[PDB]
Design an enzyme around this catalytic site. Sequence first.
Site, PDB file in Angstrom:
ATOM      1  N   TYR A  26      35.283  27.372  54.169  1.00  0.00           N
ATOM      2  CA  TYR A  26      35.530  28.708  53.584  1.00  0.00           C
ATOM      3  C   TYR A  26      34.385  29.356  52.925  1.00  0.00           C
ATOM      4  CZ  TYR A  26      38.156  32.746  52.210  1.00  0.00           C
ATOM      5  OH  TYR A  26      38.847  34.151  52.014  1.00  0.00           O
ATOM      6  N   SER A  29      34.001  37.099  50.608  1.00  0.00           N
ATOM      7  CA  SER A  29      34.533  36.464  49.529  1.00  0.00           C
ATOM      8  C   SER A  29      33.684  36.454  48.363  1.00  0.00           C
ATOM      9  CB  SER A  29      35.046  35.034  49.958  1.00  0.00           C
ATOM     10  OG  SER A  29      35.613  34.330  48.768  1.00  0.00           O
TER      11      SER A  29
END
Lengths: 253, 256, 254, 253
Positions: free
Chosen positions: D157, D144
Site C-alpha cells: 500500500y 495517503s
Amino acid sequence: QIIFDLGGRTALVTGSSRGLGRAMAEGLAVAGARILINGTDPSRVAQTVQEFRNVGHDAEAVAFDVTSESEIIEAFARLDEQGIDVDILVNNAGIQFRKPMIELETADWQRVIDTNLTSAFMIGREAAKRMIPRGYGKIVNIGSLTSELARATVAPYTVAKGGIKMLTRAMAAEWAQYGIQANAIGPGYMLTDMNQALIDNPEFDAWVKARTPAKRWGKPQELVGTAVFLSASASDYVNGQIIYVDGGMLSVL
Amino acid sequence: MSNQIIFDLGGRTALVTGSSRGLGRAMAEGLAVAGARILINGTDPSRVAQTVQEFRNVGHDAEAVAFDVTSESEIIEAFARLDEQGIDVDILVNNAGIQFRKPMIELETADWQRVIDTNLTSAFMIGREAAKRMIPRGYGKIVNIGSLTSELARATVAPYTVAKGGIKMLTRAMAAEWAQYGIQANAIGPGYMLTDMNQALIDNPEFDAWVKARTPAKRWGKPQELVGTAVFLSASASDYVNGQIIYVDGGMLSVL
Amino acid sequence: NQIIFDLGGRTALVTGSSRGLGRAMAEGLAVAGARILINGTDPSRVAQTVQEFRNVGHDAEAVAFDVTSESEIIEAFARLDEQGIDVDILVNNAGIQFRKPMIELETADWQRVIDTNLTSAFMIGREAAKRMIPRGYGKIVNIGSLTSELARATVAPYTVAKGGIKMLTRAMAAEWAQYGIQANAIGPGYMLTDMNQALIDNPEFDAWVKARTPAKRWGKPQELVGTAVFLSASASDYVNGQIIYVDGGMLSVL
Amino acid sequence: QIIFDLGGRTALVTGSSRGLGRAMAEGLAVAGARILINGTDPSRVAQTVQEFRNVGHDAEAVAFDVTSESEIIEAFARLDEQGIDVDILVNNAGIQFRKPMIELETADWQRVIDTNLTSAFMIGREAAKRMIPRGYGKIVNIGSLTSELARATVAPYTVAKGGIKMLTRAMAAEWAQYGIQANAIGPGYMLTDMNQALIDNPEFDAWVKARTPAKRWGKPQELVGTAVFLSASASDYVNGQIIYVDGGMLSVL
Ligand SMILES: [Cl-]
Ligand SMILES: [Cl-]
Ligand SMILES: [Cl-]
Ligand SMILES: [Cl-]
Ligand SMILES: [Mg+2]
Ligand SMILES: [Mg+2]
Ligand SMILES: [Mg+2]
C-alpha cells in the site's frame, strides 16, 4: 579507515554485468567486499566475473531473472547451500521505456513496474529473511532523480522509482529494528551507455549542463562513494534515506 | 585492509564551529582521523584548549580559532588571520547553534532572534566567508548541521525548527550558487543523539521511551555515528553530491 | 453559495495588503465574505485601499503598522481587542525580496529579508494565536514561495526565509492544531505582479519561466485567491501544516 | 463563489459508492458537478445514485472493475457514445492489505499495486485522451500519508501510494501544457468503515490522537474542500502537488 571497509562482507548487486551496477560493484570490491555479479545473460555475467577476478576481486556469478520469483528463491537457496551470506544487497536492476502516457501500452507500463519495483521487493525480502537472524545487513535501492521529479515520456519509470523511494522507507520501517539499514541512491544524469542517446543529443546535453548547478554530467564512478558509505558501518544509524548524486539538480529550480 | 582513497582527507583543513564539545567535537575528531587538519571553535576557551590538547595527544594536527559565530566582525577578523597564515579552509562544518525550549505564545522575540542568529545567520556569514576563498581555488566542502526539525516540527522548539529549516534551504541556496565553482554544499540532520545537549530529554523516561518507540532502529544514536556521514560529505567520495541533507536518525523521519 | 467556502462573519487580517499580491488576496477573502483588516506601513495608502474596498461593497478596516515592529504589532492588536474585533484569519503576506549573490550579500540585507518575511510572521502569528486559542478556532495562512522548496542563485535570503516560513507553518500546526487552529502556507511560483516586473521584462527570464513550467506560463495574481480562501475557510478544517505550491507544476518536474 | 463552482463540469469518482469516495463525490455534487458514481456492488452504486438524486444532484452509475483495462476502455466508449464528458477524474479506488514483507505473498503485493496504482494510470490515461482535445481537465489522485511516510505491515500500500504521488507529477509533466491539472490528496486517519478495525483498537485509536497535532481522526466529509479546490478554477495554476488532509500528522515528529 575501518568504518568504510567492507572486508568480510559479501554484496549482491543486481544488474552488475555492465553499466552503473558494474561500476558500483567494482567500487564495493575495492572497498573489500566479495561481489556476486548478476544479470539476465549467463555468459555476460560470467565474462564480468572473470574480469573482476583478473583484477584480484573475489567474485561469483549469480545470474537470474530479477522478475522471476522462482529464480530469485532458487538463487538464494543456492547461495545458502554454498555458505554464502548476502550482507549487502544493491537493487540496481531496472529497465527504461520512453513513451508518452497516452501512447503507453499497459503491458509496457507493467514491465517497467515489475523490473524496477517488484524485483526490488522480492529480492529485498529474500535477502532480509537471512539478514534478520544474523542481526545485520545493508539494502541499497537504486532510485533516480525521477524518484522525486517527473519528466515527460518516462512516467512508468518515474512511478517505479517513486515506488522505490517508498519501498526503501517501508524496508526501514520493518527491518531497522533487526539491525538492517535500507537506504537508496538517486543517480542524476550519468555518462553511461544507457544514456548514450541523450548524451549524443546536443540540445539534451546543453539542458543537462544548464539545469545542473555543477554544470556537468556525473561519471559512473562518482556513485561509488555513496554506495560504499551506504554499505559500510559508516552508515549504521542511517535508515530510510535516499541520497541523490546529481550535481545539485534536484535542489534547484 | 582496503586501500581505497576516496574517503581520505589528508591535505585538507577543516573548520568545525562549535567543536569544543558534543556532536561538533565528535565530527571534528572523525575528520582528523580521516586525515584533516582541524580548526576547533567554541565559546568556552578553557573547554576549547582541553579539546585541542586531547586532539594533539593522539596525533591530530589541531588548533583553536576563536570567534563568536554571531559576530560578523569577529568572523571576518578570524578569516583574516587565517588568510595571512596561508591557511585554506577546505572544509567548513557549520555546527554551532543553541536550543531554546518554549511554546511560541510564551516565547520572547529576543529568544527567538538569538536562536535564529546562532543557528542560521551564523551559517550564512561563515559560509559566505569560506566560499569566497574556496571559489578562486576551485574546490571546497560546506557541511551544514540541520536537524530532524529541518523537516518535521516539534512543539516548544519552534525557533530551532525554523532555523534548521532555514539551514536546509541555505544548503540548497549554496549549492545553487557555488556548485559551479567546484564547491559541494550538503547537510547532516542528526536524529536524537546521546549528548549532554539532550540530557534533559535522555533522563526523562517518557521522552526516552518515545524515542525508542518512534525510531524504527528503536534506539538513540551515538555521536560517533555522525562521523561516517561527515567524512563522506567532506571527501572526494561526495564530489557529485550537492544540496543534499542526509538524516542520521535510525529511520525516524521515514515513518509514521 | 457553497457554504464550506463562505467566510461571512469572519474577519481576516492580511499584512501588506494595501497593494500587490496582498491586496489581491484580501480582495478574494472579501469576495468570499470576510471583513478585511487592510495593513501596510503607510496609513494613507492603507486608508485609500480600505475606501476602495468599501465603495464596491466589501467591509474593510484600516490597520496600518510596521510588521517588523513588535511594539506596533502589540499596539494594533490592543486596539482591535478594545473595539471587540476578532482576528479569525491571519494572512502573513508581508515580506521583501532582495536579489544578490551570497558572496556579494551584506548581512544587513540578509537580515532585512529575514525580519520582514520570517520574524514578522512569527510575531504576528503569535499575537493572533493567543486570541484564537480561547475561541477554539482560527486560520493562519503564511505566504511561502516555490523557493521554500527549491533554491535559485541570487535569491538566497528569500529562499532561506521562505524555507523558514514553511517550517514555521509546521511549528504553528504542532503547537496550535490541538486548539482548533489551522496553520498552512501558500508557495506562489512566478506571478505576473509588479514586484517581479524586472524578471517579467527580461526576455531570457520570461522564456525560462515558460519553458521550465509544465503549464508553460506565468501565474496571475488572482490565481492565488482560491488557495487563500480555501485555507481560510471551513473547507480546510482538517488541513494543517501544509504548504500548497501554486506554480504551474514547476516544483514537480525536472 | 465562482472560483469554487463546478457547474457545467462532470466528475467521475472511482470507488464512490461508499466511504471517502462517496463523501468526495457528494461535495463535488454540492459544488455543482454532474457526478458519475463507480463501485463494485451494483446495488450499492444504484442506492448511492438514488440518494444523490433525492437532494437534486445529477448522478449516474458508471460500471467498471478498476483493474480491468477492457472494462475501463468499454466504459469510456459508452460515455463517449452518450455524449458524457469526464472533466474531473478522482482516482479513489483502492484496497488495503496488512502483512509484514517477509510474509507477504507476491500475488498480494501485486493485487495492491494493480488496484491502487495501475488502475489510476489506466483510468487517468483514458480520461486524459479526451481532456486533451478539450484543452481542460482535472485529475485528482488519492494518495495517503503513506505516499510520504512508511508504516510497518502496509508496504505494498505504501509503495503504491508513493507511486500515486509520482504518477501525479508524471501526469502534470505531460499534460499541464494541454490545460490539465493533475494533483493529489493524501487523507490522514479518517473515520471510515474500512478503518473500523483500527478505530476499534483502543491502542491504535489513542496513537492516532497522540500522533496527530489536531488530536483527532478526520471525518470523510473533511476531504470535500480539498477535492473541490483541486477540481475547480481555484486550482488552475496548481499542478503536480499532493495536499495532505491529516490534522497535521505528517508535519510533526
Ligand atoms: Cl567513471
Ligand atoms: Cl559516540
Ligand atoms: Cl502601505
Ligand atoms: Cl463525514
Ligand atoms: Mg592542504
Ligand atoms: Mg468573532
Ligand atoms: Mg446541484
